[PDB]
Design a protein around this ligand. Structure first.
Ligand SMILES: Nc1nc2c(ncn2[C@@H]2O[C@H](COP(=O)(O)OP(=O)(O)NP(=O)(O)O)[C@@H](O)[C@H]2O)c(=O)[nH]1
Ligand SMILES: [Mg+2]
Length: 532
């Protein structure tokens, strides 16, 4: 055979623990060394100690909770996972979250303790966490230093020896999982796939199972590390497929590729279309025009299958777009790329979640993605529901108090509390996503001096006493500033907002009066004295 000598794995680790550095050592070690494609579906050849040469496929994985779905699809493409832990940090929020996603996909997990070179490295501690928190055999852990290439070979041997080979039938109908993708100006929309059953080759007539759309394969291969064309990809392989595909939304992550003529029985399970959770209005800033902004968004969207947006207008700001993102990082990523890659200046509103509103006289509940569209008439509202998430937090004991007070301030309900070790606390909180996206990240970071980490997962919608607040400047209402808040938190948010603009607005002549109203009732006033 030969598929018996294949190894499909990924690296999962909390941000900064050394994922990239380690992947570099692996490629370097194995020899794997402008129309430049992101690292993905990298094929490597490794001659093990047992004398045999193995074909290893490194699947790159997202690291932020925003790309959780994408992360799970990549894990579904592997047989194993290298769980990288910083020896000087120990297990953190994403370490645990990823570990469980790996477990959920029945992956063989190889814990790798990185940064053993650091003076602050504490292996015995980390080994202790691995056993008590993860339930893994401390002795299975591999000690390494990706910075100094220490333990690389040991990792490659663990991959060969502990991770089982792919199991599929190349003679069966094609069945390939799409775990990633990107837009290639020449090849078109290309999908990075894991082949479970069958084979695929140029000229083949393929079909996407979620849509039933068909294409003719023009090229297949993998990164070696450069995009290299192969004659085919067979059961067990990881690579890419080009087939004159218009855009990345035609080859959605998690979808299944099969043959149009002889389609596989069922698609790989777990497909889910992209699901925006956080929206914000984006308007041109400075000299940048609406056209340039729209042009930039169109060009950007080509390479992003999750983003959505639609024209939006505000009296003050004018013409802009209501954009939906997977989360705060996704939003940040998009902003930086519009300004840095298309060089447009933008003004972004405070982000907001999607509310479900039930109004009298309207049978179906409405999804509100823009606060401006939240009904102005409170009496017409029967109820409002907002998304909630389960937040997991890991922090040194010393900061538990301030953190608990923060979560509670943000309407969090504690569900669990455990000790990862004598000085490390684990916390689980059910919190509204709307509270988490305002300033939770920086507050939790400053109070923990950056030592606390957190992760979260959507757990559903729940009714809440939410209301719409409007912001007025010189009796002039700025709909772009209207926002949704819980009735009990309204007063504080109002003050913060007013006090925020009191500084954000440039001191000038005519006194500017900032008011935050609650259905016509001013509940926060802030005015900046006229110049002179
Ligand atoms: N001392 C030491 N530093 C290391 C080691 N591995 C990585 N680093 C350092 O840690 C920093 C972050 O490493 P990197 O590999 O980028 O982390 P990551 O997990 O890929 N981060 P992200 O998910 O954001 O891409 C870099 O400054 C890098 O040089 C190691 O074994 N020892
Ligand atoms: Mg990295």
């Amino acid at each position: 055979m030969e598929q018996k000598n294949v190894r499909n794995f990924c690296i999962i680790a909390h941000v900064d623990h050394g994922k990239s550095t380690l992947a570099d050592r692996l490629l370097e070690y194995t020899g794997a060394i402008g129309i430049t494609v992101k690292m993905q579906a990298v094929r490597m050849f490794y001659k093990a100690k047992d004398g045999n040469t193995y074909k290893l496929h490194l699947i790159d994985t997202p690291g932020h909770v925003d790309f959780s779905y994408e992360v799970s699809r990549a894990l579904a493409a592997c047989e194993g996972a290298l769980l990288l832990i910083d020896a000087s940090q120990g297990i953190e929020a994403q370490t645990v979250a990823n570990f469980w996603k790996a477990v959920e996909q029945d992956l063989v997990i190889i814990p790798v303790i990185n940064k053993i070179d650091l003076p602050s490295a504490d292996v015995d501690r980390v080994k202790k966490q691995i056993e008590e928190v993860l339930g893994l055999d401390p002795e299975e852990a591999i000690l390494a230093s990706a910075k100094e290439g220490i333990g690389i070979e040991e990792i490659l041997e663990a991959i060969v020896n502990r991770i089982p080979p792919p199991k599929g039938d190349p003679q069966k109908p094609l069945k390939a999982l799409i775990f990633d993708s990107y837009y290639d100006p020449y090849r078109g929309a290309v999908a990075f796939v894991r082949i479970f059953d069958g084979e695929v080759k140029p000229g083949d007539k393929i079909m996407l199972m979620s849509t039933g759309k068909e294409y003719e394969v023009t090229e297949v291969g993998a990164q070696t590390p450069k995009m290299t064309k192969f004659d085919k990809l067979s059961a067990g392989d990881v690579g890419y497929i080009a087939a004159s595909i218009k855009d990345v939304r035609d080859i959605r992550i998690g979808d299944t590729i099969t043959h149009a003529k002889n389609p596989t029985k069922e698609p790989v399970p777990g497909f889910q279309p992209a699901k925006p959770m956080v929206y914000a209005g984006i308007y041109p800033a400075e000299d940048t025009t609406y056209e340039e902004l729209r042009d930039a968004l169109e060009k950007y969207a080509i390479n992003d299958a999750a983003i959505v947006y639609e024209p939006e207008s505000s009296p003050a700001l004018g013409m802009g777009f209501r954009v939906g993102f997977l989360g705060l990082l996704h939003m940040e990523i998009v902003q930086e790329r519009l300004e840095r890659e298309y060089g447009v200046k933008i003004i972004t509103t405070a982000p907001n979640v999607i509310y479900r509103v039930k109004k009298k006289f309207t049978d179906e509940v409405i999804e509100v993605r823009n606060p401006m569209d939240f009904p102005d008439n409170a009496g017409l509202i029967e109820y409002v529901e907002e998304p909630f998430v389960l937040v997991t937090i890991i922090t040194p004991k010393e900061y538990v108090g301030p953190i608990i007070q923060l979560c509670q301030e943000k309407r969090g309900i504690q569900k669990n509390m455990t000790y990862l070790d004598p000085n490390t606390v684990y916390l689980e909180y059910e919190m509204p996503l709307s509270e988490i996206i305002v300033d939770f990240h920086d507050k939790i970071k400053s109070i923990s001096r950056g030592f606390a980490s957190y992760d979260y997962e959507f757990i559903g919608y729940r009714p809440s006493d939410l209301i719409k607040l409007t912001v007025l400047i010189n009796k002039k209402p700025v709909d772009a500033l209207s926002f949704i808040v819980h009735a009990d938190r309204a007063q504080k948010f109002a003050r913060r907002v007013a006090e925020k603009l009191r500084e954000t607005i440039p001191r000038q002549l005519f006194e500017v009066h900032i008011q935050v109203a609650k259905g016509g009732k001013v509940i926060a006033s802030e005015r900046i004295k006229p110049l002179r």
